[PDB]
Amino acid sequence: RSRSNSGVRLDGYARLVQQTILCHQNPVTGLLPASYDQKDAWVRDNVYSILAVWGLGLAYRKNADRDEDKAKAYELEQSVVKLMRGLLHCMIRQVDKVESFKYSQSTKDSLHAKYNTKTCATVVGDDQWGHLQLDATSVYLLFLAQMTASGLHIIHSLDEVNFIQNLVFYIEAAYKTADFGIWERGDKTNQGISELNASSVGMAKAALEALDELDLFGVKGGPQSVIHVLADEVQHCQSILNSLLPRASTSKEVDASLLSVV
Amino acid sequence: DNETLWDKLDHYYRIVKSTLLLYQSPTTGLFPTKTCGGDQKAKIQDSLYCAAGAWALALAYRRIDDDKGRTHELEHSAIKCMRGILYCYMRQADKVQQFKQDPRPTTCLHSVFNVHTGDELLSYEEYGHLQINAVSLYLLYLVEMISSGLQIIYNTDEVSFIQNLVFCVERVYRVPDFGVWERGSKYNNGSTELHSSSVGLAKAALEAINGFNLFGNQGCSWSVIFVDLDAHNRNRQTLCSLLPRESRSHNTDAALLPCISYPAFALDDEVLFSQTLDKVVRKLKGKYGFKRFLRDGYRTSLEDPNRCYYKPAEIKLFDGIECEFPIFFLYMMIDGVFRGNPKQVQEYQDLLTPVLHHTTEGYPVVPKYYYVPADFVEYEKNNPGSQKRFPSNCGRDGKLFLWGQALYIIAKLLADELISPKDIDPVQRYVPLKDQRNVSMRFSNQGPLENDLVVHVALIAESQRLQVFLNTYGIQTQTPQQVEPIQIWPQQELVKAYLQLGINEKLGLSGRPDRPIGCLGTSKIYRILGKTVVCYPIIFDLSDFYMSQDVFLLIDDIKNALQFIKQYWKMHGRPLFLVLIREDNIRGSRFNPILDMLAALKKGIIGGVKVHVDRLQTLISGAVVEQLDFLRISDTEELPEFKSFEELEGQQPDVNISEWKDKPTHEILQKLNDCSCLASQAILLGILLKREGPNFITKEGTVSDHIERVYRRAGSQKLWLAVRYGAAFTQKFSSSIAPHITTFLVHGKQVTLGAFGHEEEVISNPLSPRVIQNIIYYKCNTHDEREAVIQQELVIHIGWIISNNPELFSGMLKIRIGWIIHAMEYELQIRGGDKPALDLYQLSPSEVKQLLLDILQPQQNGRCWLNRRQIDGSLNRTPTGFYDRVWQILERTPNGIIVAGKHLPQQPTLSDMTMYEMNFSLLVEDTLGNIDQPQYRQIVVELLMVVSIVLERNPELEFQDKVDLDRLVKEAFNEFQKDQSRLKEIEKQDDMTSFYNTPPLGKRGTCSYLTKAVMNLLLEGEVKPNNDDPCLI
């Protein structure tokens, strides 16, 4: 008759997520600014920062037998959809960069790490920031595959299916592409030198495996909505991970971001 | 036909994927207007219908279990478009906040967006963005897709924005807009004008979205959208008044089908529906499509593409060559499927097939419009509908009309019965003749034709001393303390409670605007913060104005409020009408009128409205309670308890206005102490606020509040002079005047607010309370401040009559206030005899209404005919259809009409407008305006009637020269003298009196001499041999 104690304690977690994370979600774009000083949304941070909302929504959905705890489950689930869709629009507004990066894996043609949290536009230019972060698109691609597998309908059109498919080729060459990485500074020196970080190589391998024969439309999908991943690039990332580890790169003996890979 | 349903749906899938879904923006989800050309324009109206087309095919594919992922692709193609409009709209949340507070063409939501970014594309100067059809259709379709199962709204933050969109739609009844055709009218002046389609779509949007959970099945009490019934009701009153006309300029428009049929179905009265359908079918249907409106020059051969606005004379060249839009064959096709008429579906299908074009792959292309070429314009004008038209969009060119292509999918899927009418109408916008039990949609429990609504009337006395003392006269009442856990509120406290609804500090949205809640809103039972609150009607508020203090008007306000609720309450529960009685209503002779009304309520019937008098606890037990949950979801459980109603525990002015105003000495302050009358005080305090600053100190206190005390205190005595000065010198303005004016002009009636012989301001278009407040006090009247108070007195009074007795002002096209206040002030002179007559500012507001009603009567009984022509003339009352007869006159006078130095020519008058048109009716009074004597006006208005009698029944005669009616009035004049001089030789010369007193119909009446005057000049012309009755000789 009354709500289960799990629902009651999730309210304290709902307050914690709302007061800390979900109160900063942009009304229009669904994106999350890093802070009040840094009013922009990072692709990697936004994906990571939405996990609490996604976990809470899954936690609330476990007991969805009443109108209210169905609705807060719906809010948390669709707030995650809003952010992942909002982050999709940021990258889909840079399809020219995705197309160019597939053939020429250059930093000048990489998806921007930070976007306008209010309009899903590029705040900074292609050279004003360390933009090539293959572990930021991969953290999006991995969780996009995982959130669809959990039932969250993020991809809405077959054109976005093509975009995500083209994003696979964007992160395919992570084993052979140097990038600034999880810390947006490249090598240990912090001198604009991109390096092969195990975080980017590892993240792409997981994202590629996550997207491997994945129906972006969920169960109510078809072969048109399936992302096809080639295990050549997946296991090539392994050959690099085995060789790199326990090091994060040739310049780093270790990085704590490898916890995001191992 | 052994085809499997997969192959039938695959047929439309290819069309949908290649003709409209191929162009959906990956970023914003919007559909560009121009498929080829690189244009960034994405119209909300067009994008909304494109979302419906993918949604419609998704509903069809819902019948295929092995959909191969096409249901998800088409369902979420609609969601992608629906959320993109939301993305564009929420990026303009600062404009939504502005449009809520002050609806204006320069503060509205944009209707055109960049298809690739969602940015603002065109400014208010380049494009007319005020298109309520876009916002209303968005709200309507948002309800439709969410009801069908499409999840568009993702969080309460979006729910707050949708609530603010509803607020922007509530006020639309007073907001002129550019309409669907982003043009406003035929004249293309860039002038916003009230459209039936836009207001009707707002009515459709408000009905579907009221109490609608934006989360769908995954929803709770904090996602339901609240809709103000009364702003919806005033939106419907506008729609019913404007119809069967689209607007002031348009007698009919093709936009009516989207309004009165799919997707809106905004008309709930089957008589009007039919009337409005035929004018579209008759005056706009064509072989190649439907014409948007008569004399529509959009994309015509006679249109200058560079110019964005049409000349006043350019609309003439647009007759017969209007572009025909095939999209409305589809709209009629959807109408046929919805309404169960298969002949209509087949008939309009047989018309689309010739006009349909096809791509290289055979996919149907619906052209946007079919235009007559420049080589064939003049043949078309002579014989309309006989010359070939070329398609705007043909396919194979790259240019596709996505709105037409999307609407093709919806109609064909319905025609082949692949989607049911209820599938695209999950919230039932179309209801069959089984029209019962739909909230907000005129279908109460009784149905569409019976309206014996019972209103729950709760008798509330302000104090126990009133409670027991009324009880001693057989009336049972309860003080608020007697109804204790329940809270009786002023309607303002409900507005203060409603201020928290829809607030988003993240979007900068401030909640529901501070606007009074009317009778229907206060008729609801509210539960706020765990307290059940019932608000008494605003008619019992003693703050807005002082005619609520007049007991007779309050009695009539109580009566007409009940009739207003009887007519416009269409919810599940029975309305609650709390009657508040104050001690001022009982004290004095005001008991006898108040007691009979209360006895009638106790008897069970008042004003013909069935009422139920019972305790408030009885009338609250099982009624539906409006849960103001937004006041608790924000955790404002400690919000200040809104102040509920608290129980309470003789000569004519000896000082003339000119006597002391002319007096230069300032000793009048001592004269204030010297005199003892309230009116003398009410004038002395007024100059003190002007002569000695706004907030000077007096014996009682500050000037500002001392006049307020006098105004409050003067009303208690019912010394009406002081209460009229008291309200005038404080610039008092009740909230009802501005909506009352808007009610006037939506009935076709221009309003002028100013005293006789001074500056009068014509209210052509609906105006906000702010400007009308500036209008009624600052610019209009400055000779006397009490002119505004008397000006506002009638506006409510005419607002009272225009609804109860609409026929009473028939012919009176211009309600001119000061001209009307002349009619009462001149009537007082007439009734005053050779005695000092009554002053219009001495009469109680009841006598102001009664005398106004007396001087309005269809035919004053038995009065001097001179005086009748004075009462009708002063009101500018014209016969029914009088303005029409002026056409038949002007149609047959080549050189026109000249009267009092004002000339009405045959051209360009006949060429510019139509003879049901409102503009011509305004033109006559402008030509008729120079006649100073109201009695002289009527004899001319009489003459224009009789010459119309001569012209209609005698088509052979036609005037040669200009018809100078003053001469005809003068010519028929002397014949009256020489006839009456032969009778008794009246020595009065150039006196209209004898000529005015004689009745028209009689032995020697006015129209007899007027008839002779016409024929003498009418027989001065060549007769035309007529073939209708070939002359036997």
Ligand SMILES: C/C=C(\C)CC/C=C(\C)CCC=C(C)C
């Ligand atoms: C063959 C004879 C005629 C066609 C009659 C001509 C008509 C007139 C001289 C004016 C008649 C006016 C009336 C009001 C009846």
